[PDB]
Design an enzyme around this catalytic site. Structure first.
Site, mmCIF file in Angstrom:
data_model
loop_
_atom_site.group_PDB
_atom_site.id
_atom_site.type_symbol
_atom_site.label_atom_id
_atom_site.label_comp_id
_atom_site.label_asym_id
_atom_site.label_seq_id
_atom_site.Cartn_x
_atom_site.Cartn_y
_atom_site.Cartn_z
ATOM 1 N N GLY A 29 0.439 -8.822 4.620
ATOM 2 C CA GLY A 29 1.668 -8.475 3.905
ATOM 3 C C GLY A 29 2.449 -7.426 4.674
ATOM 4 O O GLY A 29 2.256 -7.277 5.880
ATOM 5 N N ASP A 142 5.936 7.872 -3.495
ATOM 6 C CA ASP A 142 6.079 6.410 -3.458
ATOM 7 C C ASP A 142 4.981 5.687 -4.262
ATOM 8 O O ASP A 142 4.414 4.683 -3.817
ATOM 9 C CB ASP A 142 6.157 5.918 -1.999
ATOM 10 C CG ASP A 142 6.930 4.598 -1.841
ATOM 11 O OD1 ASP A 142 7.491 4.061 -2.825
ATOM 12 O OD2 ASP A 142 6.982 4.104 -0.698
ATOM 13 N N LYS A 144 3.837 3.119 -6.639
ATOM 14 C CA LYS A 144 4.280 1.802 -7.078
ATOM 15 C C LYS A 144 3.103 0.859 -6.967
ATOM 16 O O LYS A 144 2.090 1.214 -6.355
ATOM 17 C CB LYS A 144 5.443 1.298 -6.236
ATOM 18 C CG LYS A 144 5.239 1.329 -4.728
ATOM 19 C CD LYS A 144 6.458 0.712 -4.040
ATOM 20 C CE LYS A 144 6.358 0.732 -2.520
ATOM 21 N NZ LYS A 144 7.532 0.041 -1.907
HETATM 22 N N1 LIG Z 1 0.316 -0.992 0.296
HETATM 23 C C1 LIG Z 1 0.009 -1.959 1.189
HETATM 24 O O1 LIG Z 1 -0.165 -1.657 2.349
HETATM 25 C C2 LIG Z 1 -0.124 -3.407 0.757
HETATM 26 C C3 LIG Z 1 -1.439 -4.120 1.210
HETATM 27 N N2 LIG Z 1 -2.318 -3.393 2.149
HETATM 28 C C4 LIG Z 1 -3.691 -3.580 2.156
HETATM 29 N N3 LIG Z 1 -4.272 -4.682 1.696
HETATM 30 C C5 LIG Z 1 -5.588 -4.864 1.717
HETATM 31 N N4 LIG Z 1 -6.184 -6.027 1.233
HETATM 32 C C6 LIG Z 1 -5.599 -7.316 1.130
HETATM 33 C C7 LIG Z 1 -4.229 -7.621 1.248
HETATM 34 C C8 LIG Z 1 -3.775 -8.931 1.092
HETATM 35 C C9 LIG Z 1 -4.662 -9.956 0.812
HETATM 36 C C10 LIG Z 1 -6.024 -9.667 0.690
HETATM 37 C C11 LIG Z 1 -7.043 -10.685 0.383
HETATM 38 O O2 LIG Z 1 -7.814 -11.002 1.268
HETATM 39 N N5 LIG Z 1 -7.139 -11.210 -0.867
HETATM 40 C C12 LIG Z 1 -8.124 -12.211 -1.305
HETATM 41 C C13 LIG Z 1 -8.101 -12.260 -2.852
HETATM 42 C C14 LIG Z 1 -6.684 -11.747 -3.234
HETATM 43 C C15 LIG Z 1 -6.256 -10.887 -2.012
HETATM 44 C C16 LIG Z 1 -6.481 -8.360 0.842
HETATM 45 N N6 LIG Z 1 -6.391 -3.929 2.180
HETATM 46 C C17 LIG Z 1 -5.884 -2.763 2.670
HETATM 47 C C18 LIG Z 1 -6.547 -1.661 3.199
HETATM 48 C C19 LIG Z 1 -5.782 -0.665 3.589
HETATM 49 S S1 LIG Z 1 -4.090 -0.995 3.350
HETATM 50 C C20 LIG Z 1 -4.502 -2.566 2.672
HETATM 51 C C21 LIG Z 1 -0.922 -5.382 1.978
HETATM 52 C C22 LIG Z 1 -0.122 -6.250 0.998
HETATM 53 C C23 LIG Z 1 0.990 -5.609 0.688
HETATM 54 C C24 LIG Z 1 1.002 -4.266 1.434
HETATM 55 C C25 LIG Z 1 0.296 -4.713 2.757
#
Ligand SMILES: NC(=O)[C@@H]1[C@H](Nc2nc(Nc3cccc(C(=O)N4CCCC4)c3)nc3ccsc23)[C@H]2C=C[C@@H]1C2
EC number: 2.7.11.1
Length: 283
Positions: A29, A142, A144
């Protein structure tokens, strides 16, 4: 922290592949420092933020480090390390399996709706994360749903400390659909974080994003006024993708949301009161 080579991170993210996970690539993302990439280092799944003006970006990079060096907590995301050696700066974290609260509330990539029981635990954890930050004299700026991550047990983990400040009123920042009136004017207070958490709680109750241009009201914080004027009830806005919500506890959480969304900063509750109010909900 551990230290990473830029080319190690470039290698384990398929040369920073920007297409999504489901199609084939590594983009999870997009956030404050742009795109976040999935990778694998030291037999461990990792989230990699690539920090791609360049001068203002480095100040936010150091802020993420200075905040995450001292502030270790159950409800804060964990930084494993960083990379300064290659072309752009990078930050590595422990991958949160369930991604963001925002994405799970909208059921992105076909994940099942969050139950009410799950939603309450997340509300509590997020408040506990915000409490730790205010005890240690930090303002996030921030809060949210995109910046509340969900671990293997759906524990709330607060993230993105690039725009955070340690402890005033010319550089206004944040996400306008979540920002308080005084923060939009330029005040830096921990009371602004409580307002934003108010909106996040409305997202949890309703599963609606804070803003949607194909919706009336376009801004979710405006439903507070619809409910007070008795045009609609909170029960009319409850997320219909739950099978386990009850009236009392929902009204209890909305009461905490409503108090958080007071426009006068001194009349809002502090985080310890919000945390206490949310414990009384489940008990
Ligand atoms: N504030 C952010 O930075 C958000 C998020 N950042 C992160 N995401 C994830 N995990 C993540 C993300 C997307 C998919 C999945 C996934 O495998 N599934 C399988 C079952 C459902 C989801 C896991 N881990 C970390 C660790 C440190 S920052 C971070 C990202 C999305 C939006 C932004 C970037």
């Amino acid at each position: 922290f551990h230290s990473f080579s830029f080319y190690e991170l470039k290698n384990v993210t398929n040369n920073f592949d920007e297409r999504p996970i489901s199609v084939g690539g590594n983009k999870m993302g997009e956030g404050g420092f742009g795109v976040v990439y999935k990778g694998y280092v030291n037999n461990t799944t990792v989230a990699v933020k690539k920090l791609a003006t360049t001068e203002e970006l480095k100040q936010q990079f150091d802020q993420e480090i200075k905040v995450m060096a001292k502030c270790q907590h159950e409800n804060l995301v964990e930084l494993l390390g960083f990379s300064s050696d290659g072309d752009d700066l990078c930050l590595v974290y422990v991958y949160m399996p369930n991604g963001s609260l925002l994405d799970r509330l909208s059921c992105l990539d076909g994940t099942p709706p969050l139950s009410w029981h799950m939603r309450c635990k997340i509300a509590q954890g997020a408040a506990n994360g915000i409490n730790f930050l205010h005890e240690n004299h930090h303002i996030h700026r921030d809060i949210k749903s995109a910046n509340i991550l969900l671990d293997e047990a759906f524990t709330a983990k607060i993230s993105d400390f690039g725009l955070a400040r340690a402890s005033v009123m010319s550089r206004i920042v944040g996400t306008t659909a979540y920002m308080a009136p005084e923060a939009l004017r330029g005040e830096i207070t921990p009371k602004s974080d409580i307002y934003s958490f108010g909106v996040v709680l409305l997202e949890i109750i309703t599963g609606l994003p804070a803003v949607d241009e194909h919706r009336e009201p376009q801004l979710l914080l405006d439903i507070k006024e619809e409910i007070e004027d008795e045009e609609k009830t909170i029960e009319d806005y409850i997320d219909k993708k739950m099978n386990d919500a009850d009236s009392t506890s929902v009204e209890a959480m909305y009461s905490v949301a409503s108090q958080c969304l007071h426009e006068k900063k001194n009349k809002r509750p502090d985080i310890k009161k919000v945390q206490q109010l949310l414990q009384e909900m489940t008990a």
